[PDB]
Design an enzyme around this catalytic site. Structure first.
Site, short mmCIF file in Angstrom:
data_model
loop_
_atom_site.label_atom_id
_atom_site.label_comp_id
_atom_site.label_asym_id
_atom_site.label_seq_id
_atom_site.Cartn_x
_atom_site.Cartn_y
_atom_site.Cartn_z
N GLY A 20 -10.14 3.45 0.09
CA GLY A 20 -10.57 4.67 0.74
C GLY A 20 -9.75 5.86 0.29
O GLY A 20 -8.92 5.78 -0.62
N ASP A 32 3.24 -5.12 -8.90
CA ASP A 32 2.39 -4.11 -9.51
C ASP A 32 3.15 -2.81 -9.70
O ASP A 32 2.64 -1.72 -9.43
CB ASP A 32 1.10 -3.88 -8.70
#
Ligand SMILES: [N-]=[N+]=NC[C@H]1O[C@@H](n2cnc3c(N)ncnc32)[C@H](O)[C@@H]1O
Length: 340
Positions: A27, A139
């Site tokens: 989002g 990550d």
């Protein structure tokens, strides 16, 4: 119910005067005025409940960030959601507002050596805490390093994070992987599931190289291309390093390659501080067992003006199968403390 870009951004009344920033994984990310604390904040809207995978990464991020407390790790200030599971369709994570991130910054700004040193120090200081909690970020890359206007750096996005599991790290050749390609250690493509701390150190080395030149050091265009780039600079692995790879398919792939010479770091980076390049070489070491660990990196001469182990704290309490309904329930419970 405020709207931004035609969709619901339902954060009032505490948070007003919204401004779009960008697109998160699940989002929109906006800035907003915190009427209670009288400062502007960042708010991430997250809509994960249709998909088990999204629920997993959302639960990971919330659980880890709520337990961690560290200057170089983004905190969660507040979580906004409906009062009941039935009514909860979205969750909003409120964080300190950070002016930019290292990915955006590197698109247009050359870093001074002092900035590179300071950024690298803060990355490793935050990483020391993460690893001390037995957690792998998995990550790390420029866009997950947030920066405020005084260049305080905070690591974010623990959606792919895991608890370290070195006994179960081994896998076959060309095993698929999720984390961002350009920052993947060579062993991911050869024989590793990315369950050891050395996976994160490789990414930091990639980030350091990228701060030195404003370009990714290993910009592979696809899964096996990534290994081509790494070996094109490091050169062919030594016999000793090959002998550590017991998997035949991976070892024979490397043996099938023509010999490649190492490219000297100071030819790739002729402007760089020589101590930075020495540390770079130790983070971008092919063999993950020889690769420098986070506490050794902090003690490297390049970071001498900042290194202070007593001011580099560790975690007080170190740390796939669940359907999305149970995960929505766990997200609801994990966010209850902010209701009210
Ligand atoms: N996450 N994400 N990416 C979407 C955008 O949100 C930005 N962002 C994420 N967290 C924050 C944050 N805490 N403060 C300011 N901007 C932020 C990030 O730099 C991207 O431009």
């Amino acid at each position: 119910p405020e709207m931004v870009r035609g969709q619901v951004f339902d954060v009032g009344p505490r948070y007003t005067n919204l401004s779009y920033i960008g697109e998160g994984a699940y989002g929109m990310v906006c800035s907003a005025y915190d009427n209670l604390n009288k400062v502007r904040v960042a708010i991430k809207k997250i809509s994960p409940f249709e998909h088990q995978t999204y629920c997993q990464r959302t639960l990971r991020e919330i659980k880890i960030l709520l337990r961690f407390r560290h200057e170089n790790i983004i905190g969660i200030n507040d979580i906004i959601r409906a009062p009941t599971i039935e009514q909860m369709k979205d969750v909003y994570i409120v964080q300190d507002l950070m002016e930019t991130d290292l990915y955006k910054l590197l698109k247009t700004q050359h870093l001074s050596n002092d900035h590179i040193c300071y950024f690298l120090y803060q990355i490793l200081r935050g990483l020391k805490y993460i690893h001390s909690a037995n957690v792998l970020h998995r990550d790390l890359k420029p866009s997950n390093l947030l920066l405020n206007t005084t260049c305080d750096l905070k690591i974010c996005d623990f959606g792919l994070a895991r608890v370290a599991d070195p006994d179960h790290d081994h896998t076959g050749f060309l095993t698929e992987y999720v984390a961002t390609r350009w920052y993947r250690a060579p062993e991911i493509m050869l024989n590793s599931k990315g369950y050891t701390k050395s996976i994160d150190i490789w990414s930091v080395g990639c980030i350091l190289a990228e701060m030195l030149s404003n370009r990714p050091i290993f910009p592979g265009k696809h899964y096996l291309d990534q290994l081509n780039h790494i070996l094109g600079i490091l050169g062919s692995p030594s016999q000793e390093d090959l002998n550590c790879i017991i998997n035949l398919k991976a070892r024979n792939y490397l043996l099938s390659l023509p010999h490649k010479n190492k490219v000297p770091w100071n030819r790739l980076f002729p402007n760089a501080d020589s101590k930075a390049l020495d540390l770079l070489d130790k983070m971008l070491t092919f063999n993950p067992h020889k690769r420098i660990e986070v506490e050794q990196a902090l003690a490297h001469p390049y970071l001498e003006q900042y290194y202070d182990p007593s001011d580099e704290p560790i975690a007080e309490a170190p740390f796939d199968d669940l359907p999305k309904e149970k995960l929505k329930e766990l997200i609801f419970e994990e966010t209850a403390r902010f209701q009210p």
